[PDB]
Design a protein around this motif. Sequence first.
Motif, mmCIF file in Angstrom:
data_model
loop_
_atom_site.group_PDB
_atom_site.id
_atom_site.type_symbol
_atom_site.label_atom_id
_atom_site.label_comp_id
_atom_site.label_asym_id
_atom_site.label_seq_id
_atom_site.Cartn_x
_atom_site.Cartn_y
_atom_site.Cartn_z
ATOM 1 N N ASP A 43 0.216 -1.593 -8.853
ATOM 2 C CA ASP A 43 -0.104 -2.107 -7.508
ATOM 3 C C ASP A 43 -0.921 -1.059 -6.744
ATOM 4 O OD1 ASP A 43 0.022 -3.837 -5.283
ATOM 5 O OD2 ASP A 43 2.063 -3.171 -4.733
ATOM 6 N N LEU A 44 -2.244 -1.171 -6.838
ATOM 7 C CA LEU A 44 -3.140 -0.152 -6.300
ATOM 8 C C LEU A 44 -3.489 -0.255 -4.836
ATOM 9 C CD1 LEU A 44 -5.333 2.049 -7.241
ATOM 10 C CD2 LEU A 44 -6.918 0.113 -7.338
ATOM 11 N N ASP A 45 -3.539 0.911 -4.187
ATOM 12 C CA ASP A 45 -3.995 0.932 -2.776
ATOM 13 C C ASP A 45 -5.503 1.136 -2.815
ATOM 14 O OD1 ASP A 45 -4.805 1.605 -0.193
ATOM 15 O OD2 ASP A 45 -2.995 2.823 0.163
ATOM 16 N N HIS A 46 -6.238 0.055 -2.560
ATOM 17 C CA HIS A 46 -7.689 0.061 -2.606
ATOM 18 C C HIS A 46 -8.379 0.858 -1.522
ATOM 19 C CE1 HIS A 46 -6.688 -3.213 -5.402
ATOM 20 N NE2 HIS A 46 -7.954 -3.221 -5.794
ATOM 21 N N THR A 47 -7.674 1.296 -0.480
ATOM 22 C CA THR A 47 -8.300 2.132 0.538
ATOM 23 C C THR A 47 -8.282 3.607 0.152
ATOM 24 O OG1 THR A 47 -6.278 2.544 1.835
ATOM 25 C CG2 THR A 47 -7.511 0.524 2.297
ATOM 26 N N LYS A 48 -7.580 3.962 -0.918
ATOM 27 C CA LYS A 48 -7.455 5.370 -1.304
ATOM 28 C C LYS A 48 -8.201 5.794 -2.557
ATOM 29 C CE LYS A 48 -3.039 6.215 1.045
ATOM 30 N NZ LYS A 48 -3.797 6.305 2.319
ATOM 31 N N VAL A 49 -8.840 4.900 -3.282
ATOM 32 C CA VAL A 49 -9.598 5.260 -4.479
ATOM 33 C C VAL A 49 -11.007 5.684 -4.081
ATOM 34 C CG1 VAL A 49 -8.346 3.655 -5.986
ATOM 35 C CG2 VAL A 49 -10.460 2.935 -4.867
ATOM 36 N N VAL A 85 -12.002 10.357 -13.512
ATOM 37 C CA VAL A 85 -10.756 9.611 -13.760
ATOM 38 C C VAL A 85 -9.963 9.531 -12.453
ATOM 39 C CG1 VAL A 85 -8.555 9.536 -14.994
ATOM 40 C CG2 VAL A 85 -10.644 10.271 -16.183
ATOM 41 N N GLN A 86 -9.791 8.336 -11.939
ATOM 42 C CA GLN A 86 -9.101 8.069 -10.689
ATOM 43 C C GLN A 86 -7.615 7.840 -10.890
ATOM 44 O OE1 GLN A 86 -10.206 7.372 -7.153
ATOM 45 N NE2 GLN A 86 -7.955 7.623 -7.068
ATOM 46 N N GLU A 87 -6.802 8.640 -10.177
ATOM 47 C CA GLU A 87 -5.365 8.434 -10.261
ATOM 48 C C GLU A 87 -4.998 7.118 -9.563
ATOM 49 O OE1 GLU A 87 -3.094 11.375 -8.248
ATOM 50 O OE2 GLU A 87 -3.318 12.892 -9.829
ATOM 51 N N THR A 88 -3.992 6.435 -10.075
ATOM 52 C CA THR A 88 -3.542 5.234 -9.363
ATOM 53 C C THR A 88 -2.655 5.661 -8.184
ATOM 54 O OG1 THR A 88 -3.579 3.749 -11.257
ATOM 55 C CG2 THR A 88 -2.140 3.154 -9.440
ATOM 56 N N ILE A 89 -3.060 5.293 -7.000
ATOM 57 C CA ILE A 89 -2.325 5.520 -5.770
ATOM 58 C C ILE A 89 -1.610 4.198 -5.445
ATOM 59 C CG2 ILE A 89 -2.360 6.200 -3.374
ATOM 60 C CD1 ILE A 89 -3.570 8.266 -5.394
ATOM 61 N N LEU A 90 -0.296 4.146 -5.548
ATOM 62 C CA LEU A 90 0.407 2.891 -5.303
ATOM 63 C C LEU A 90 0.601 2.544 -3.833
ATOM 64 C CD1 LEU A 90 3.352 3.382 -7.875
ATOM 65 C CD2 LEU A 90 1.279 2.061 -8.253
ATOM 66 N N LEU A 91 0.670 1.248 -3.555
ATOM 67 C CA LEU A 91 0.972 0.766 -2.213
ATOM 68 C C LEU A 91 2.464 0.981 -1.912
ATOM 69 C CD1 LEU A 91 -1.105 -2.533 -1.931
ATOM 70 C CD2 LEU A 91 -1.285 -0.430 -0.561
#
Lengths: 149, 151
Positions: free
Chosen positions: A4-10, A143-149
């Motif tokens: 569940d990715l936070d799209h404002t943080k990638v 490589v982008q870490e997954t930042i969860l919501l």
Amino acid sequence: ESFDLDHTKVKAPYVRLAGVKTTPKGDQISKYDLRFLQPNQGAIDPAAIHTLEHLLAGYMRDHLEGVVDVSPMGCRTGMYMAVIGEPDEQGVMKAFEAALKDTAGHDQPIPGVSELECGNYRDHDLAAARQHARDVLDQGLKVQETILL
Amino acid sequence: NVESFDLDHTKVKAPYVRLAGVKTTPKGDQISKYDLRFLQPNQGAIDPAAIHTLEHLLAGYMRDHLEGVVDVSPMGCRTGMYMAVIGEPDEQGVMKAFEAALKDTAGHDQPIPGVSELECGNYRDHDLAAARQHARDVLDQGLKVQETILL
Ligand SMILES: [Zn+2]
Ligand SMILES: [Zn+2]
């Protein structure tokens, strides 16, 4: 299977493992978010993403084993690709980088473009697909870490 | 070849469900790929907003009716959706699941799940009414299992 990715943080563009599904026999299917554009800051035109889909189907396979398929995301800011194997963001990133160079330099007809081989053969844009590939390479992948919501 | 059948798109009859290819994993599982075709190839295309909404809705509704879904994505040609599933080919079972998910989609009068700046990469590009009507159009026309005719 789908973080569940936070799209404002990638930070696009990037390669990100988006999930991993274990198969009944014990193998793994790794899903990758191949992000060209920053979420919610613009989208690839439909013709261009269609052309990217046709080009990357062959060019990702030239640089990476186990590809299931490369598909456009509905949000049109990147492509989704499932691969048979353990997660390997670094290797996928290198393969994507090589396939993007191939894409940017593709100066022949788009493969599989006809009423026989494509469901919307009139909706293609080779120049825009090539420019999007150059744009990613110019900005540089990571490589982008997954930042969860 | 076998991972992606060389379909002659002029011979199919939308809407339909069709096994589009099969890839095996090393230990022996099959990843069956399916062509969930809404519109007849080259006779029109689903709007980008509506196919985006269909992706968000079918991601959950296909999973409600079918096990082993890897993912459901829009095709670049925008005449249908692509879905990979862990399991041996089962066009009939996939057809039944897709029919049930389309009935769910047609009847979806709640927020599209995952639509916000936090959860979606293009949150403004959605159209629930159009997605629902595309789903109802498919059920009105009637689905069938389409055979692959090779070029
Ligand atoms: Zn196409
Ligand atoms: Zn979305």
